[PDB]
């Protein structure tokens, strides 16, 4: 039964996209809010199919009435909800399933005082008594942004979904859109895919009963702290976080799941932002958490470094078995030219360990990675050489010199000798920790391959999650070589 | 209520709704609305935008100043008047006009050219889709079955919206009409 619900939802949005190109993220987003009692905000230039999406969602229900209205500066409440005689509200807003309000950032003070009461309570003042409003989806489109200190900020804080629609960009999707013969005022949804009034009231009870796992809540536990230390982060109150749970629970209910999935957090990129400055910060902070702390991407990166540091510690401890012999060469030269090993070493940025550690540049080091392009010039011509410490930082100058037994001696500030050595051609302790970390990467990758088929997930976001998981698996495979 | 009569072609007649057989909608005024006013919704939906003015030719002013033709009569013969059946049949054949690949290269080039200039007027997706309905009918009533590149001249009275966009739309289209329309600049 729960698995068959994802098929009907995926087939319902397929018929709604007929005639609307590059609008898949806008149709699937309005469908989730229509079946959960939420709202959706659209931002963009006038003329990007912002009014057809409001008239297309009414076909998914058996009894749904549309309402199109443009809020003006001189508009009166007697024209939106209906004039009074006791109020002739036949076919307006109190008795409409889907309402459309174009340009909401320019209405009068009387309309703003009435729109904030039909969302939290869904009631209307019919003269004396009050009556409920069966509003299933509230969409609002405009073009500009409201002021930072005005009366229009109260309606923006209550709108959960805030989408930023724009014109088409693909050339192949523009030819079929410019020559579309599908009627926009027709009914392209079959009767078998249309939901009834009984299914809408039953789904509202099953949304709040979705189990909340403790591992999925850890993502919002850390994402909330990152959006508070930065001064450029948008202010997200507790009312916005409470309404985001209903949208996340309903996203997994219509996808054939009983619990909240960590992949449902991508929908938060169109709910926390509020202007053009917060768009580049919300989409960047979520992308880091979705490719870091989501599927244990960053959690396994910091754990892999401990295995590499432990492997380098065991290599520098047993460096007394393999030394470093430098062969000599003949020829006619004024200086003693030295040659490196032939086929024994071929890497350019090879690493060379050392026995007794020293204090270089007021810090400790365990391995010095040299360059093959600069080692040949120092062993023949001479002069000074450079080299970074611990494989990081800039190439600092060291006190490298030759020894009597054809070895490399590195001195510091106290004239302390240290013979260098190269790592030989995997211990049991390193292979044990590497096998346990590799098993966690396969278990985390299996969870992503079982929940990425959600309908409320964009297509361009799947390319970044797969690329981030493959980077962690490629780094752990190089250490076991 | 005027916006619903164009998209939905209906009217809220109390309870039930009824269709409106509006075949032509003409709106005239004198001035232009504000840039941040609510009147821009009806302006963005109007396809053809003509800027009429007074006469300038001296020969055409003498015959116009002394005209004996009645403006409230019927100077159209009965043989040239279309019927209700021909109007409903032509609406189906307009959308069936093929779109050649050579015409698509000119529409995408003119659209991307206006998005780079800051002083160029913005053209929405509704303006591009509705302009094809007038361009496909221009070749259907002229004896053609496909969209001709010569039909791009009609865009000079649709893309503009004020006095600042009039000198830029008529100049950008004239370059494409005398450059990439007949492979003038391509050669
Ligand atoms: N990006 C788009 N893709 C497909 N069709 C579109 C797009 N933008 C507009 N249209 C078409 O243009 C028609 C009119 O749209 P309109 O209501 O003017 O958009 P808006 O409400 O943004 O002004 C619609 O029937 C729609 O099919």
Author numbering:
A (entry chain D): 3 to 87, 98 to 437, 442 to 497
B (entry chain E): 126 to 312
What's the paper's own text on this?
They are proposed to fulfil chaperone-like functions assisting the maturation or assembly of metabolic protein complexes, and are often found in an operon upstream of a gene encoding a von Willebrand factor A (VWA) domain-containing protein. The most well-characterised representative of the MoxR family is the E. coli ATPase RavA, encoded by the ravAviaA operon, together with the VWA domain-containing protein ViaA. Remarkably, RavA and LdcI together form a 3.3 megadalton cage-like complex, consisting of two D5-symmetric decameric LdcI rings located at the top and bottom of the cage, surrounded by five RavA hexamers.
This second conformation may represent an intermediate state between the “seam up” and “seam down”-oriented RavA spirals inside the LdcI–RavA complex. 3D classification and refinement (see “Methods”) resulted in two maps (at overall resolution of 7 and 6 Å, respectively), corresponding to an open spiral with a single nucleotide-free seam and a planar C2-symmetric closed ring characterised by two nucleotide-free seams at opposite positions. In contrast, the C2-symmetric conformation contains only four ADP molecules bound in the active sites between subunits 1–2, 2–3, 4–5 and 5–6. The 27 Å gap between subunits 1 and 6 in the spiral conformation is much wider than the seams in the closed-ring conformation, meaning that rearrangements between subunits 1–6 and 3–4 that destroy the nucleotide-binding site are more subtle. All of these residues directly interact with ADP in the intact active site interface. A comparison of the C2-symmetric closed ring conformation of RavA with the 4L-2U ClpX crystal structure reveals highly similar assemblies.
